[PDB]
Write an enzyme that holds these catalytic residues in place. Structure first.
Site: not given
Ligand SMILES: Nc1ncnc2c1ncn2[C@@H]1O[C@H](COP(=O)(O)OP(=O)(O)OP(=O)(O)O)[C@@H](O)[C@H]1O
Ligand SMILES: Nc1ncnc2c1ncn2[C@@H]1O[C@H](COP(=O)(O)OP(=O)(O)OP(=O)(O)O)[C@@H](O)[C@H]1O
Ligand SMILES: Nc1ncnc2c1ncn2[C@@H]1O[C@H](COP(=O)(O)OP(=O)(O)O)[C@@H](O)[C@H]1O
Lengths: 507, 180, 475, 90, 282, 295
Positions: F154, F180-181
């Site tokens: 992705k 997000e991380r």
């Protein structure tokens, strides 16, 4: 007695006394506002804030006033002054909105100028009663074969277009709009002409623009008006826009004209009402929807009516649209609207992914009016078509054993498959009623059973051009008599025989 | 108990202790009358467009320009600090009731039609020896269900002495319908 | 007494009186208003304040407007002059034929008849429908319920029962519409003026003569507020109590969408300041219904037969409203969408349907045993649905296959084409007597019709039609 | 519905013109107690997430600062805290 | 100054009364001189004994597989229209022989039928069915119907227990049938919600356990020093879709000495009474 | 304007002004502690009081602490200088490479395009991928769902779309990370610096030179409170509207997840006290999603 003291110290005291027509904002949030003042304000009254924003005086408490803002809560501040307009929430009507996209309040957005004004009919009016109303006794030419044959739409009806997303609801709506062009241009008499209104609620603005472009392309804005309340627009405006469209159609209903409104999303209106209620701290219910949703929808849909002989004779149909979730019709809102409507047009994702378009199911689609919304010529054919399609739907469970089955069953399957492949149509390609009658005659007289399925497209097209080139006399005789006499029937059979002679097909 | 009850008890207490009773009583009465006569002071109190500083300034100018104690000014500053100025009327009423109850009660009373000075004197002297309260300012009324016998309520709630004809009659009847 | 409006919230109005208050349920007329706005008192709040519910829309009201107390609750006229006539909740006729020249008026609110003045006599009704004449017999002088969702044929069933009962009744009748379509209201009015149930005659000078009518009409429809929807059934009940108390006659009472009587409360209590119950319904959901239902009862003076249509939201029969309503009925008929999707009409579920007049001491022993055998058969067929869906009929034994065959056959035989369906079905109507239904069920259970097909029972009435259809289908 | 500043021990001072607000931003009086929570009047100056200390040696965290009071959560049992107990910051 | 109380005695036998002892038969007043408080403290651990006498129900599956004693509290739980009232009416009807064939009040069984939420037509039908069989000279009825206010519906079962404690304490025996015991909880919900008390789950309050415990702990079998009486209990419950995982059914199953389940599948298959003897226990 | 804090309830700060209240959605800067704190107005309450949602943590805040009103909502910088950079919801950089020297600034709350300024002619988007351009053709001005986690390619699909759209259509791009991380953000940044999507060339003095890149980055980190994860898509959307409106380009905008926008909206509504809808989601769900997606 002491007013000199206040006039001296406050420096502006004498002006804040007349709280009957002017008020002061106190709190703001969640599309709601609280005002202090405005003691002579009517309920439902239109209110004008400081920066041109507008609202509705919804709640009149003992001291404060609760107002709903037709916009975003950034043009309104605590401390801002508020005036009375002196009139209930109203929108313009008449000729002048035709060909015009407008907001909920008659304010244009296409950038072409202002809109003329009648006496600005109100919005939340009461529907008619029982005496001036009249039963439905004439059709509304939609231009779709399956609809005009099996699920006929009347003139004074309230029929629902229900189905999941990407199924051809806007497509049905726009074919129903485009088919009225020839009927309107050919008449020049507003007693027979049918206008229209298209209400977009929570819809993508690009989609609305594309729709308007396709209508200006096909000259279908001389007799339509559009009311846009998109996803970016506020929730009060989405809650309004349907009522504004119905108020625009009440002019035709009361003036003897005929019209049709298409609310392309009512679930978004209900979502916005739920929003406003939960932000007004009201107690939720089933699926968090309040109890005033049935009343909310029925206020709007009970206005669609056929006025009688002494009220002019006008009419106003209504084609509300509903999106479901996984075909569930046992939900709350679909059942609330099915208990209000006089029919049902169902649309499927199975049929829409297979390729059948328009994906109008026929066992779930119904119509309470029925034959009374048809012409005799189309009655005589759509009756047989409905019967044969019912038989085919019944006996399609054992179609794989067609070789094991009798010739009768195989003939039924062949006729049903031919009809199913004949009910298909292209996008933005309606059909006249005489042409529909001719095509369904060809279909129900076995002229398509031996013919291959895939050929039926070009077959149909060629036949149409044939009867639009040679047999215009047949077409006009059908459009005039509204009946298939034996003479026109024999002429049509002769034309069909000449066509099958002069044309080659796969079978 | 209530908010106005709280402020009224505090004011009645402090005005009985230090400044005086009559001063603060007259001050509250004057303020209440100005509130019910001016018809713009009330709006000045209720409106939120008035800033706290303008409020305090006008209140101090009323203090200086009128016969006014410091206790009432502190009351008004407190009510403004806590957003309780609309409760001025209620507070005033609460202050009014206590003093007249301390001094002398007002009582309701009913007859059939106009009695005479003689039995009026008898009624007042009998109710006075019954009360043993040296001050009594009464009411006269006319309700004819209690036929003519003088019914009343000496206003303290827990004494409604029902000296009437029809009431004693019906009570007696309902008593003597007893079994055996 | 005069009063002032102080606050307005939708369908709720707060009023302030100076001298003397009105009691609860009393009517108030608003003066500075276009139409005749009427308010019904509901609560008292202190400060000589009163809360009221409006019988029309509040758009146009002002804090300061004037209100007049009528001193009594809403009053609806009564007599033989209400017959053959429509009347809204406040008694005003909306037939556009003149006023109602009735001598006496009754209050919308009346206390129910007592315990001693009740008479539970077991009778039966001749509906002409097989499913109810066999498995859920209707009680003459009792309450009947038609439970269903949306689009299952409640209104059609009520119109058929009207055609098959009221015309063959002789006594009086009433129809209330609580949130029903104005279209079908006008349709009923015109079908009654057609069939002679309403006999309107236009005298000269624009007068009218409804003499000869045998049905009254009360309509508070979807285009009405909750206050004008939660008080229509009470009007109809007053109109029927006049008949079955003074005139002594036996009356019929058809009611359409009694569920709205609760829905209105649900969209009113939130504005009246009440805490919501499980699904937003009221805490008074049981008492507000019982005070309506206990007025419906046969007594020593007369009789009310009643036919109520009960909505079922989201096809959920466990909702508190229908759950409570189930306890108040003498006969029941639960329509289903699973059965309507099969094209069976009336789509009656004969297992959820029930009655109290099915015992052998009321209907005979052959009727009782036939009904119980049919129920046993249909339950034995229900019990195989899962294994049939997964595996198929081939797994079954032969007794089970015979059961499935007879169950499908009696399902298709318990379907009837009505007369009012001819407009969208085409096929003529079929009245069916009870002994014919019983003989047919007996034969289908015994096995005297296993030779016939399954689609020969669809919409045929008796068995002679089924056998003629099987003959014609043999070709 | 009453605020801690409106009780009839403070209004006896405000009505009496007493201006003993010299009680610092460090010290406050307990107003309510329950279920491991305390509610104080004062400490205008205390930070959110700050430690406070009671008369009887215990300590707590101030979490819900408000316009009229301060909300405190206790690291112990509520039997020690009552009736205007003094609370001081750390 | 009086706490809410009701008359007790044999003057109630043969009569129909509301929640407060006011008669509605229309024939005469209530000849009873001794009253009793409605809400009372149940009897404790010491003035009780074990259950050793049977309560003849008249049915077969009950009397064989789900027996009932004198001093028990057995629940009758099922769906609507399954034979709950009919079970109770047969239990009542079986006693007229036992009572006619004696004059020993220690052996006669008197009966109380509390009807909560029922309609007067149904109550009249029941009274008619009992008069047709002479089964009213040892019963009484307590009708708190739907038109009757919430507090009367809330008080009727406690009034029945008050009328039964006269038998329980006076050396005699008794049986009490609470019909539509869920309407009691409906009425309590209604009262607390109109008194602005805060709800719990399913909008009920939390005091429903202490609503049913007070009531069912008055059923008891007393010792030979307190007379030797008894008060049996046979509550009735209507479930929805057979859901016995709910709150009220769970509470009442958890506070009873048995269960008699009733099913529609068995009611229509041909088994009448439709008692499931697997789930049903004692 | 200048106001004072009056109470602090988690991420919900109530502020008092003496005159000329700020409008809703305007920004307020707290004064008197480090870690510059910014509060977005959301609601007026009376008594010249307003309610605000904080973009960072509220620990260490004091009542009476002073607050300034910027006079406009959160204003992100825009330009070709924002290419290759990382930015937080308040426009500040979190890449430790210097400040954004842009000549312009755009609010994050902008009205959508009107009905007149909208193209009625739809047209595909020439990506350069075969399965995409054959069986799922993209559109200009469109919105494409991407159902897939890791182990599928992705990130590489993203970088290829960016590179091809920049080469052919000449357009820039934006990547928004909505909760997000952080290690995932670090990985994506280093993958871009490897693949050439970002050009971070050191300079002699010690500064950096973000030369010709193809994507800006806007990151609302998981450690940030609700309100940032809710106004990050709007920050990136204004950054893209700059290129659309003025530069006149066809740009891209990748969104790491659209469900966390809804999570943050629901949280914010719970803090502000709004009654939740069916499944806990806010009652302003479709309205807020439309305010986002109609731009
Ligand atoms: N008869 C048809 N023939 C060819 N294409 C069709 C036909 N009907 C629909 N389509 C296609 O289906 C797609 C959706 O069209 P449409 O806007 O009518 O759907 P919709 O019901 O409005 O769905 P939604 O409101 O959720 O967006 C379009 O891509 C359209 O081209
Ligand atoms: N042994 C039985 N034999 C024949 N019929 C029975 C028998 N038991 C019950 N029935 C029938 O069950 C139906 C309900 O009767 P009953 O009065 O017991 O209702 P219920 O079980 O209390 O439920 P509800 O009160 O909610 O209606 C009746 O139709 C009755 O005839
Ligand atoms: N006797 C019937 N035969 C066949 N179809 C019927 C029959 N009655 C109703 N239907 C269907 O029932 C539906 C409407 O039933 P109705 O009770 O009027 O709706 P609702 O329950 O919402 O009031 C129509 O689709 C109609 O075609």
């Amino acid at each position: 007695e002491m007013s000199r003291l206040l006039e001296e110290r406050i420096a502006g005291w004498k002006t804040q006394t007349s709280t009957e027509e002017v008020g002061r904002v106190v709190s703001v949030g969640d599309g709601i506002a609280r005002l202090f003042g405005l003691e002579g304000v009517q309920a439902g009254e239109l209110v004008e804030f400081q920066n041109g924003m507008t609202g509705m005086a919804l709640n009149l408490e003992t001291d404060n006033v609760g107002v709903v803002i037709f916009g975003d809560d950034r043009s309104v501040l605590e401390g801002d002054s508020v005036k009375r307009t002196g009139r209930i929430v109203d929108v313009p009507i008449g000729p002048g909105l035709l060909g015009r996209v407008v907001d909920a309040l008659g304010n244009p957005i296409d950038g072409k100028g202002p809109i003329p004004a009648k006496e600005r009919r109100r919005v939340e009016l009461k529907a008619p009663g029982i005496i001036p109303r009249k039963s439905v006794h004439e059709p509304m030419m939609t231009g779709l074969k399956c609809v005009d044959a099996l699920v006929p739409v009347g003139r004074g009806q309230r029929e629902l277009i229900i189905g999941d997303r990407q199924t051809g609801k806007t497509a049905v709506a726009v074919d129903a709009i485009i088919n009225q062009k020839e009927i309107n241009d050919s008449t020049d008499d507003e007693s027979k002409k049918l206008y229209c209104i298209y209400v977009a609620v929570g819809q993508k603005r690009s989609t609305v623009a594309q729709i308007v472009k396709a209508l200006e392309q096909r000259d279908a804005m001389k007799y339509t008006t559009v009311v846009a309340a998109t996803a970016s627009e506020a929730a009060p405006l989405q809650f309004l826009a349907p009522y504004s469209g119905c108020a625009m159609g009440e002019w035709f209903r009361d003036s003897g004209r005929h019209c049709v409104i298409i609310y392309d999303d009512l679930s978004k209106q209900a979502t916005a009402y739920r929003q406003m209620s939960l932000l007004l701290r009201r107690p939720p219910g089933r699926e968090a929807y309040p109890g005033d949703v049935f009343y909310l929808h029925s206020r709007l849909l009970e206005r669609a009516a056929k006025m009688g002989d002494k009220s002019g004779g006008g009419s106003l149909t209504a084609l509300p649209v509903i999106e479901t979730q996984a075909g569930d019709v046992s939900a709350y809102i679909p059942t609330n609207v099915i208990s209000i409507t006089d029919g049902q047009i169902f649309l499927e994702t199975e049929l829409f992914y297979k390729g059948i378009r328009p994906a109008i199911n026929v066992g779930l689609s119904v119509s309470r009016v029925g034959s009374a919304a048809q012409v005799k010529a189309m009655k005589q054919v759509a009756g047989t078509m409905k019967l044969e399609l019912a038989q085919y739907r019944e006996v399609a469970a054992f179609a794989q054993f067609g070789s094991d089955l009798d010739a009768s069953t195989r003939q039924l399957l062949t006729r049903g498959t031919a009809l199913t492949e004949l009910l298909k149509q292209r996008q933005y390609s309606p059909m006249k009623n005489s042409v529909q009658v001719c095509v369904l005659y060809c279909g129900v007289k076995g002229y398509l059973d031996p013919l291959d399925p895939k050929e039926i497209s070009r077959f149909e097209s060629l036949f149409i051009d044939y009867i639009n080139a040679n047999h215009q006399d047949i077409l006009k005789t059908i459009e005039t008599e509204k009946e298939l006499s034996e003479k026109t029937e024999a002429k049509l059979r002769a034309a069909v025989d000449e066509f099958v002679a002069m044309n080659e097909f796969k079978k | 108990q209530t908010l106005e009850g709280r402020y009224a008890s505090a004011l009645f207490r402090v005005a009985k202790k230090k400044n005086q009773l009559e001063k603060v009583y007259g001050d509250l009465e004057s303020v209440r009358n100005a509130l019910k006569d001016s018809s713009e002071f009330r709006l000045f109190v209720d409106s939120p467009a008035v800033s706290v500083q303008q409020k305090l300034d006008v209140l101090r100018q009323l203090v200086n320009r009128y016969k006014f104690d410091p206790l009432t000014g502190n009351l008004l500053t407190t009510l403004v600090e806590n957003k309780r100025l609309p409760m001025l009327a209620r507070v005033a009423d609460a202050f009014d009731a206590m003093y007249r109850k301390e001094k002398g009660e007002v009582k309701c009373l009913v007859t059939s039609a106009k009695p005479l000075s003689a039995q009026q004197q008898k009624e007042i002297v009998a109710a006075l020896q019954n009360r043993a309260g040296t001050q009594a300012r009464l009411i006269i009324d006319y309700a004819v269900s209690p036929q003519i016998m003088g019914g009343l309520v000496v206003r303290l709630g827990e004494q409604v002495l029902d000296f009437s004809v029809a009431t004693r009659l019906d009570r007696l009847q309902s008593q003597l319908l007893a079994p055996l | 007494n005069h009063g002032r409006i102080t606050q307005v919230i939708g369908a709720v109005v707060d009023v302030h009186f100076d001298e003397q208050l009105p009691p609860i349920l009393n009517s108030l007329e608003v003066q500075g208003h276009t139409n005749r706005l009427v308010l019904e008192v509901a609560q008292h709040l202190g400060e000589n304040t009163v809360r009221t519910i409006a019988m029309d829309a509040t758009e146009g009201l002002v804090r300061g407007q004037k209100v007049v107390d009528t001193g009594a609750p809403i009053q609806v006229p009564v007599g033989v002059e209400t017959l053959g006539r429509i009347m809204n909740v406040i008694g005003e006729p909306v037939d556009e034929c003149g006023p109602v020249p009735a001598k006496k008026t009754y209050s919308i609110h009346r206390a129910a008849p007592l315990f001693a003045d009740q008479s539970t006599e077991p009778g039966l009704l001749q509906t002409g429908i097989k499913v109810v004449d066999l498995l859920a017999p209707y009680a003459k002088g009792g309450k009947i319920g038609l439970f269903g969702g949306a689009g299952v044929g409640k209104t059609v069933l009520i119109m058929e029962l009207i055609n098959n009962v009221a015309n063959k009744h002789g006594g009086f009748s009433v129809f209330a519409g609580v949130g029903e379509r104005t279209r079908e209201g006008n349709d009923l009015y015109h079908e009654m003026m057609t069939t002679g149930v309403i006999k309107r005659k236009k005298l000269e000078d624009g007068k009218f003569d409804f003499t000869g009518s045998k049905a009254a009409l009360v309509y508070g429809q979807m285009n009405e507020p909750p206050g004008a929807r939660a008080r229509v059934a009470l009007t109809a009940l007053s109109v029927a109590e006049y008949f079955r108390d003074e005139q002594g006659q036996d009356v019929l009472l058809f009611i359409d969408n009694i569920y709205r009587f609760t829905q209105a409360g649900s969209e009113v209590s939130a504005l009246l300041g009440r805490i919501p119950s499980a699904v937003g319904y009221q805490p008074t959901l049981a008492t507000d219904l019982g005070q309506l239902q206990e007025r419906i009862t046969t007594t020593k003076k007369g009789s009310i037969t009643s036919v109520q249509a009960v909505y079922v939201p989201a096809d959920d029969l466990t909702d508190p409203a229908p759950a409570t309503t189930f306890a108040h009925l003498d006969a029941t008929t639960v329509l289903s969408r699973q059965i309507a999707e099969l094209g069976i009409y009336p789509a009656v579920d004969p297992l959820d349907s029930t009655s109290r007049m099915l015992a052998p001491e009321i209907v005979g022993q052959e009727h009782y045993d036939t009904a119980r055998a049919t129920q046993k058969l249909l339950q034995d067929y229900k019990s195989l649905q899962d294994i049939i869906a997964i595996l198929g009929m081939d797994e079954l034994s032969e007794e089970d296959k015979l059961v499935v065959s007879r169950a499908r056959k009696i399902q298709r035989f318990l379907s009837q084409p009505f007369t009012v369906a001819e407009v969208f079905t085409g096929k003529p109507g079929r009245f069916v007597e009870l002994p014919e239904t019983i003989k047919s069920a007996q034969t289908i259970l015994r096995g005297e019709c296993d030779d016939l097909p399954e689609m020969a029972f669809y919409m045929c009435g008796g068995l002679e039609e089924v056998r003629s259809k099987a003959v014609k289908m043999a070709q | 519905k009453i605020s801690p500043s409106e009780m009839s021990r403070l209004l006896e001072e405000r009505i009496a013109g007493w201006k003993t607000q010299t009680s610092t931003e460090e010290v406050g009086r307990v107003v309510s107690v329950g279920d491991g929570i305390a509610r104080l009047f004062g400490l205008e100056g205390v930070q959110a997430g700050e430690l406070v200390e009671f008369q009887n040696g215990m300590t707590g965290m101030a979490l819900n600062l408000e316009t009229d009071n301060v909300g405190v959560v206790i690291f112990g049992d509520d039997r020690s805290v009552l009736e205007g107990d003094s609370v001081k910051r750390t």
